[PDB]
Amino acid sequence: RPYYIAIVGSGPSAFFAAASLLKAADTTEDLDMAVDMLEMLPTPWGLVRSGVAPDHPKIKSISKQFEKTAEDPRFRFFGNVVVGEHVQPGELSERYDAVIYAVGAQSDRMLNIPGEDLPGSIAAVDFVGWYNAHPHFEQVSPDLSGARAVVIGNGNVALDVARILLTDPDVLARTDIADHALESLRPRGIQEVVIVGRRGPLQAAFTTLELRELADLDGVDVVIDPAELDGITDEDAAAVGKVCKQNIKVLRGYADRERPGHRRMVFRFLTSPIEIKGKRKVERIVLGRNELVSDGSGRVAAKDTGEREELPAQLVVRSVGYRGVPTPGLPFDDQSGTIPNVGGRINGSPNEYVVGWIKRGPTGVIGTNKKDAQDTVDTLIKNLGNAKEGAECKSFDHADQVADWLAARQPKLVTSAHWQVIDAFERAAGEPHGRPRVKLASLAELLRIGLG
Numbered sequence: 011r012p013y014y015i016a017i018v019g020s021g022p023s024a025f026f027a028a029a030s031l032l033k034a035a036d037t038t039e040d041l042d043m044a045v046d047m048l049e050m051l052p053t054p055w056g057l058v059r060s061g062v063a064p065d066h067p068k069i070k071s072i073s074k075q076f077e078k079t080a081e082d083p084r085f086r087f088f089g090n091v092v093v094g095e096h097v098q099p100g101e102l103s104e105r106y107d108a109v110i111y112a113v114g115a116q117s118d119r120m121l122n123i124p125g126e127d128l129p130g131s132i133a134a135v136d137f138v139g140w141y142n143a144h145p146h147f148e149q150v151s152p153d154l155s156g157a158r159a160v161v162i163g164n165g166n167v168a169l170d171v172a173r174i175l176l177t178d179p180d181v182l183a184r185t186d187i188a189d190h191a192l193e194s195l196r197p198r199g200i201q202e203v204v205i206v207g208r209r210g211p212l213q214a215a216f217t218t219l220e221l222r223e224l225a226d227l228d229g230v231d232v233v234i235d236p237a238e239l240d241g242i243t244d245e246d247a248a249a250v251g252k253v254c255k256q257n258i259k260v261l262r263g264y265a266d267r268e269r270p271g272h273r274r275m276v277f278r279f280l281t282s283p284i285e286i287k288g289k290r291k292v293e294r295i296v297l298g299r300n301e302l303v304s305d306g307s308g309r310v311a312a313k314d315t316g317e318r319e320e321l322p323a324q325l326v327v328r329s330v331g332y333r334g335v336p337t338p339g340l341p342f343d344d345q346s347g348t349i350p351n352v353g354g355r356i357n358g359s360p361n362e363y364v365v366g367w368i369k370r371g372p373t374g375v376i377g378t379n380k381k382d383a384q385d386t387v388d389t390l391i392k393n394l395g396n397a398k399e400g401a402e403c404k405s406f407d408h409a410d411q412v413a414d415w416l417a418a419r420q421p422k423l424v425t426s427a428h429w430q431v432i433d434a435f436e437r438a439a440g441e442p443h444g445r446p447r448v449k450l451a452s453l454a455e456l457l458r459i460g461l462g
């Protein structure tokens with residue numbers, strides 16, 4: 011028999027793991043593999059579909075690689091299966107030789123400041139999910155009619171949020187952005203987005219192409235006050251690294267530009283949100299100035315000066331990181347929002363593993379998940395081999411039984427063939443309108459088409 015591996019999730023780390031498993035089988039005598047991928051949503055691809063911005067279609071093409079893996083007869087997909095709800099980790103661990111958790115980071119990091127729960131104060135997780143038609147975020151429905159939005163954070167997701175808020179809706183109308191978001195964006199209510207970083211430009215997590223792209227936003231001026239660069243030296247930037255060096259060149263270019271009448275994307279560094287205020291909704295934000303100070307760890311940290319400034323704002327989006335969510339039956343590190351592991355094997359388990367953001371934390375481009383997954387898979391395969399040699403493998407038409415069990419637990423599961431129907435529907439909806447697709451934005455609409 012082949013080894014039977016379950017993979018929980020269908021984003022990049024899941025698909026890289028799947029590919030690594032099948033490659034091992036293809037290149038090793040007396041080693042065969044069967045991979046079942048269980049995905050919470052009706053649709054595969056994780057953040058490649060629901061995270062990557064709608065104006066970033068090019069990198070989404072990595073999905074073709076995932077599709078090629080999914081064509082393998084040894085691979086099966088079961089969508090609309092929520093592990094922790096329909097089936098439990100302890101059940102999967104009985105039915106498979108090994109289980110790989112590739113669940114990513116499904117929630118958000120909080121600021122932990124007063125007013126954070128006011129209507130109008132949301133996380134980028136929820137805003138992005140909403141604009142990308144993720145079914146869990148269909149009702150986020152932010153009010154985008156106010157003149158000023160504030161985005162907290164200095165990673166690339168902060169740039170995505172700011173771009174979507176400020177891009178000409180006629181441009182967004184040719185993307186796969188959610189129709190509900192396009193509708194809210196058409197009035198062009200927001201005139202200024204202020205991106206607020208707690209540390210300085212040299213500590214920014216932005217990457218260079220993404221900063222450069224801002225120059226191509228029709229109708230939008232990028233605003234960086236020259237004072238934001240005082241004390242920011244090319245020497246110090248180069249010492250941080252090559253990306254930082256390039257970033258600072260780009261930021262200097264923006265600061266060199268002086269205009270009434272345009273929408274504005276403003277960068278403020280060395281600033282923290284202290285409190286969000288308003289009568290029943292966000293109306294203003296209190297900001298504090300920081301200075302950089304060595305903390306003894308090898309880095310500089312922001313230290314509050316105690317100074318306070320208030321700025322009117324009607325939307326605050328915190329882009330201060332995604333965050334893992336605990337899975338029933340598995341260990342978890344609250345502080346980091348990751349599952350504790352060693353070389354990808356989960357604590358305390360002989361046959362459960364992690365890959366991707368749930369393993370490493372929520373950082374890295376899509377490709378960073380590849381070596382990560384390979385490393386985990388190598389460990390997994392070594393451990394199976396040891397078990398086989400010790401006559402410690404489970405004894406298992408097992409593939410049929412497990413599929414029947416999945417169908418008993420989730421009669422509305424979505425197979426690969428039915429995802430392909432969803433996919434075709436969405437693409438055919440978009441192409442006549444110049445869009446790659448129009449997404450089905452709720453579970454009900456996805457299932458209307460997918461189970462059909």
Ligand SMILES: Cc1cc2nc3c(=O)[nH]c(=O)nc-3n(C[C@H](O)[C@H](O)[C@H](O)COP(=O)(O)OP(=O)(O)OC[C@H]3O[C@@H](n4cnc5c(N)ncnc54)[C@H](O)[C@@H]3O)c2cc1C
Pocket residue numbers: 018019020021022023024048049050051054055056057058061062063066069091092093094112113114115116138167170332337365366367368373374375376377379
């Ligand atoms: C907003 C945003 C934009 C990004 N843009 C880019 C970009 O332009 N370029 C780039 O290279 N990288 C980009 N990234 C990074 C990229 O998205 C990540 O590196 C990558 O998607 C992480 O992969 P993952 O497999 O760990 O998690 P994910 O892609 O999050 O996949 C996790 C999957 O697990 C599923 N799942 C979760 N819990 C369960 C459960 N209990 N049961 C079943 N299934 C479950 C989820 O539904 C999801 O499909 C972006 C990230 C974000 C957040």
Ligand SMILES: NC(=O)[C@H]1C=[N+]([C@@H]2O[C@H](COP(=O)(O)OP(=O)(O)OC[C@H]3O[C@@H](n4cnc5c(N)ncnc54)[C@H](OP(=O)(O)O)[C@@H]3O)[C@@H](O)[C@H]2O)C=CC1=O
Pocket residue numbers: 120121162163164165166167168170207208209213214215216217220282283329330331332372373374375
């Ligand atoms: N085109 C691309 O390559 C893209 C790549 N991604 C990539 O996805 C991941 C996740 O991006 P995301 O922006 O969510 O996270 P990071 O890059 O870690 O940035 C987090 C920022 O949040 C900041 N942060 C965290 N806590 C706070 C508090 N309390 N107050 C203020 N600011 C805070 C953090 O600041 P810090 O460096 O810790 O001082 C980062 O600027 C990251 O690796 C990205 O580069 C995301 C979008 C892309 O477009």
